[PDB]
Design a protein around this ligand. Structure first.
Ligand SMILES: *[B@@]([O])(O[C][C][O])C1=[C][C]=[C][C]=[C]1
Ligand SMILES: [Cl-]
Length: 363
């Protein structure tokens, strides 16, 4: 009958539309994987000025959701024995030998526990290998590696970069030529082709100034992916079913489903951040709050890596100046969700949309 499709549309509309209105979001794409089938719901405008509507193929900046792609490349390097998570960072870049990176592991970099690497590179560091090298050579930990989590692009950026070095090829080339094709992603880019620019949404900030992401140090590793809701859901489905990929890539995805420590309700994997499921909306918002992004937290290390599967919610937020993305999936329920918007709107609001959809699907 039509009831299931009507109910799903009613549910997604009811979750999305008030949040779009309340946050003045011009355009938003939702994609849901439910019972092995994709469902797309598209809202509003990709560009207010030219009237292009959002579709499941519209490209959005996903910001730090890119970190989950970076983690997958690292998972490939790891499970191919080109690196180990307990390697010292300077093993993989001679320029760092003699620096504090002699005493910092790849896991620490990946999980933001190297000792106080900041959220962003300073403005003084441009997209330049020598400036990035000198930044790391001069950096000193604020506190002991392995003790506190401080969310950081330079941290997981370096992890990604070193994983590429371990494979003997540039990060960006590996992503284009190996990772994205292995995952079946033809609408996913670090550098959007000229021929696909018509699909690239406009981003909008304060006073609706147009904003698309510019070049920056380790941008590719930290925040550089542009993709469509359909492609991002394909990536969620790969995460739900790594066994559907060839074994080297299956293993790469599995490596991003391992938790190393907890902070509050959140268990930190490579890229993904996990919660028990069900959990309250308020606790999931708290785990995705501004203090979790901006302040250091003492970790509770697990006795061994924990499988992030079963009745757990794995998620990641991503932001750029003009865009706000969120992805969440529940491995034990074969359920995934992507919410891409062309405004950077509060994380709590992204989580509210997702939670309304997930709750409604339960009910
Ligand atoms: B990223 O989008 O993370 C914020 C949303 O969790 C990010 C972090 C640091 C620099 C650029 C992008
Ligand atoms: Cl940065």
């Amino acid at each position: 009958g039509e009831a299931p499709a009507d109910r799903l549309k009613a549910l997604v509309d009811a979750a999305v539309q008030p949040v779009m209105k309340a946050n003045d979001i011009p355009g938003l794409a939702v994609a849901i994987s439910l019972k092995g089938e994709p469902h797309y719901f598209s809202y509003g405008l990709a560009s207010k000025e030219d009237g292009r509507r959002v579709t499941p193929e519209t490209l959005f900046e996903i910001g730090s959701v890119s970190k989950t792609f970076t983690a997958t490349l690292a998972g490939y390097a790891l499970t191919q024995d080109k690196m180990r998570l307990d390697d010292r960072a300077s093993q993989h870049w001679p320029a760092l030998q003699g620096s504090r990176f002699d005493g910092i592991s790849l896991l620490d970099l990946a999980t933001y526990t190297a000792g106080g690497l900041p959220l962003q590179f300073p403005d003084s560091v441009q997209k330049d290998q020598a400036q990035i090298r000198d930044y790391y050579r001069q950096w000193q930990p604020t506190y002991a590696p392995g003790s506190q989590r401080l969310y950081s692009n330079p941290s997981i950026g370096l992890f990604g970069y070193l994983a590429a070095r371990s494979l003997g090829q540039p990060f960006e080339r590996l992503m284009e030529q190996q990772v994205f094709p292995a995952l079946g992603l033809e609408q996913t880019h670090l550098d959007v082709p000229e021929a696909a620019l018509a699909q690239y949404a406009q981003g909008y900030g304060k006073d609706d100034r147009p904003l698309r992401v510019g070049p920056g140090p380790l941008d590719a590793e930290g925040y550089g992916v542009k993709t469509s809701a359909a492609d991002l859901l394909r990536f969620v489905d790969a995460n739900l079913h790594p066994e559907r990929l060839d074994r080297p890539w299956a293993q790469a995805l599995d490596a991003t489903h391992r938790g190393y420590y907890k902070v509050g309700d959140m268990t930190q994997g490579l890229g993904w951040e996990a919660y028990d499921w069900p959990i309250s909306l308020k606790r999931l918002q708290a785990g995705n709050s501004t203090p979790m992004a901006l302040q250091p937290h003492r970790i509770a290390r697990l006795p061994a890596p924990q499988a992030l599967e079963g009745q757990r919610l794995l998620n990641k937020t991503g932001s750029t100046n003009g865009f706000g993305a969120y992805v969440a999936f529940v491995p034990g329920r074969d359920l995934g969700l992507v919410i891409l918007a062309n405004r950077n709107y509060p994380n709590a609001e992204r989580v509210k949309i997702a939670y309304a959809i997930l709750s409604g699907l339960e009910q």
